[PDB]
Amino acid sequence: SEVAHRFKDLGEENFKALVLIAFAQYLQQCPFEDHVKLVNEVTEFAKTCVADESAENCDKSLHTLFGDKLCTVATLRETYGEMADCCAKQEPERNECFLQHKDDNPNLPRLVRPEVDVMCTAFHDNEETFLKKYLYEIARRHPYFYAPELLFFAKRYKAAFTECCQAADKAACLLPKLDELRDEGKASSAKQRLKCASLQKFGERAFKAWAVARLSQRFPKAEFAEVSKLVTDLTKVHTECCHGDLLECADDRADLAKYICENQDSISSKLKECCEKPLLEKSHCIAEVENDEMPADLPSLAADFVESKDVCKNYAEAKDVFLGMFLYEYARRHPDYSVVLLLRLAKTYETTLEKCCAAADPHECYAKVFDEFKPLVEEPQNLIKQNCELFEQLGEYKFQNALLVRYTKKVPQVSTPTLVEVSRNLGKVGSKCCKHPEAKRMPCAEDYLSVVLNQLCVLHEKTPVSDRVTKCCTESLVNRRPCFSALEVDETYVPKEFNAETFTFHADICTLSEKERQIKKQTALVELVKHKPKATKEQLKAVMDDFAAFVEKCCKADDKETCFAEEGKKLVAASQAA
Numbered sequence: 001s002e003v004a005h006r007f008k009d010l011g012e013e014n015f016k017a018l019v020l021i022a023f024a025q026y027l028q029q030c031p032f033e034d035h036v037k038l039v040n041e042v043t044e045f046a047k048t049c050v051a052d053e054s055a056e057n058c059d060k061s062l063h064t065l066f067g068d069k070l071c072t073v074a075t076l077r078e079t080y081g082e083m084a085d086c087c088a089k090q091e092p093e094r095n096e097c098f099l100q101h102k103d104d105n106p107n108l109p110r111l112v113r114p115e116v117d118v119m120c121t122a123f124h125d126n127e128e129t130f131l132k133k134y135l136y137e138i139a140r141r142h143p144y145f146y147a148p149e150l151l152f153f154a155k156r157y158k159a160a161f162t163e164c165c166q167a168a169d170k171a172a173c174l175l176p177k178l179d180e181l182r183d184e185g186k187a188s189s190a191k192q193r194l195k196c197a198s199l200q201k202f203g204e205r206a207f208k209a210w211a212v213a214r215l216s217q218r219f220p221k222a223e224f225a226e227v228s229k230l231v232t233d234l235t236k237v238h239t240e241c242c243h244g245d246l247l248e249c250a251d252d253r254a255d256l257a258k259y260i261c262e263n264q265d266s267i268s269s270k271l272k273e274c275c276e277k278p279l280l281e282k283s284h285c286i287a288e289v290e291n292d293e294m295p296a297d298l299p300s301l302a303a304d305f306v307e308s309k310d311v312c313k314n315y316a317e318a319k320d321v322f323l324g325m326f327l328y329e330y331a332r333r334h335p336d337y338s339v340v341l342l343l344r345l346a347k348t349y350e351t352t353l354e355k356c357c358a359a360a361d362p363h364e365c366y367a368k369v370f371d372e373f374k375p376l377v378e379e380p381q382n383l384i385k386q387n388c389e390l391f392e393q394l395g396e397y398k399f400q401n402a403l404l405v406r407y408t409k410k411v412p413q414v415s416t417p418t419l420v421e422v423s424r425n426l427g428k429v430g431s432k433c434c435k436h437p438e439a440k441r442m443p444c445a446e447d448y449l450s451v452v453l454n455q456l457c458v459l460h461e462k463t464p465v466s467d468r469v470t471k472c473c474t475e476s477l478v479n480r481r482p483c484f485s486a487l488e489v490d491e492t493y494v495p496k497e498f499n500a501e502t503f504t505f506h507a508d509i510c511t512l513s514e515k516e517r518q519i520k521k522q523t524a525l526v527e528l529v530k531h532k533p534k535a536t537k538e539q540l541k542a543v544m545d546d547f548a549a550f551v552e553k554c555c556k557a558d559d560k561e562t563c564f565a566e567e568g569k570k571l572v573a574a575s576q577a578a
């Protein structure tokens with residue numbers, strides 16, 4: 001009995017939370033009460049199966065159990081609809097139908113959070129319900145969230161409410177903490193979102209390589225066989241999580257932590273404190289842990305990978321292990337290299353041996369492989385230093401606007417809200433990365449940009465509009481950033497006529513958070529660039545300043561939104577001209 005097994009290992013509290021997540025990610029439109037009903041029914045059934053593994057139905061697949069349980073609700077169509085596709089299917093075509101229907105941008109209310117007293121009132125009232133509702137809302141808005149890590153979020157959320165609904169000042173306590181969690185939430189969601197796209201669109205060989213690269217950077221004293229074994233396990237975990245199998249994913253993640261913590265000596269000397277932690281922190285910790293120190297004596301690659309004969313024989317005899325090995329060996333030596341870079345290098349090596357070992361003088365044409373690495377290392381470095389340079393003059397917000405123009409120019413067809421979200425997360429690289437010394441700049445930055453471009457890739461995927469986005473997103477995961485880089489303003493694109501709509505604002509702008517005000521400015525800038533990509537000196541900065549000044553005047557005009565509408569016909573015309 002699999003469900004009974006997943007009960008025992010996980011315990012009831014984590015069991016229930018995981019189950020709930022699974023339902024809200026499968027059916028994001030569904031109200032809270034229905035999923036709760038479904039969870040308790042599943043827990044109730046699972047308990048009997050721990051009571052007797054021969055009890056009727058306990059032998060069935062988690063998929064069948066969850067699917068059946070789901071279909072008692074999904075079939076109601078003019079309310080749901082296309083999940084009544086899936087309900088008329090049988091396993092395993094149904095599970096895939098559920099997965100294939102995940103929505104990275106579902107038309108759901110953005111959650112405004114109410115005032116603190118009320119929130120604290122809700123927590124003390126029934127704190128189990130409050131937590132469940134927290135999971136419910138995040139999971140359905142992020143159907144690919146690293147489900148085990150979402151438990152950890154819930155844990156810290158609960159700790160914020162337990163502490164903060166006790167002090168002198170509720171809001172001063174809690175609101176900062178909820179913000180730090182909303183910040184990490186977004187990043188964590190996007191991090192996992194890329195892992196699932198590696199697996200789903202490029203297959204496990206691609207993921208495995210990514211893994212070897214990254215774990216070798218992290219665990220460089222560890223031998224290749226130890227790395228391979230962690231890599232097999234890490235992949236099994238993510239493969240399960242990206243596929244909706246949350247239960248096994250949590251269970252296999254705990255096991256992976258047990259394993260790692262018992263073998264610290266073969267692995268890294270930084271695990272000390274992660275391994276002292278409780279179950280959830282423990283995994284979270286490991287995943288976040290800084291690189292171990294490099295083995296001080298390390299021999300040059302050349303001996304076994306260029307100078308040697310048997311290069312071609314090893315290549316052919318065992319290509320996957322030989323290539324893993326190159327990548328491990330080169331990875332452990334360059335924690336100052338982004339993972340996308342190192343996989344780029346390793347693809348370059350392969351292709352070279354490919355063509356070279358097609359024997360005329362193999363030992364010759366592949367003698368200068370490392371020669372091809374030169375340009376590949378330099379392209380990122382220059383862009384990183386340069387964009388960090390541009391950021392220092394500008395700061396985060398002004399750095400965001402520059403990107404906004406850059407990428408809207410690049411791919412003008414992409415929805416406005418998408419551009420704004422993407423460019424702002426793109427600008428957030430400067431804050432996270434340029435702070436660092438060059439030792440840490442490139443991984444930080446180019447790896448971060450993978451995450452953010454992958455966001456643009458999936459958001460755009462839902463309703464495709466620009467052939468250059470689709471092309472860069474399909475082409476090759478490893479190449480995505482360069483692909484977007486090499487792109488320049490679009491000639492094909494027929495500039496947008498013009499809207500009075502899109503440049504008249506309303507008096508609600510005078511009371512918005514600095515955050516929301518930025519987003520509104522940016523939204524208008526995109527729309528601007530969309531109207532005039534070809535032409536765009538400083539003439540954009542003139543227009544944006546003409547907007548900001550009408551906004552200064554109109555927010556101090558104190559009337560009933562009148563100059564927003566009066567000066568709102570005035571200036572719409574004026575900006576097409578200037």
Ligand SMILES: OC[C@H]1O[C@H](O)[C@H](O)[C@@H](O)[C@@H]1O
Pocket residue numbers: 234253256257283284286287
């Ligand atoms: O991909 C994230 C993972 O990284 C770590 O190496 C551990 O494998 C795991 O517990 C964590 O989830």
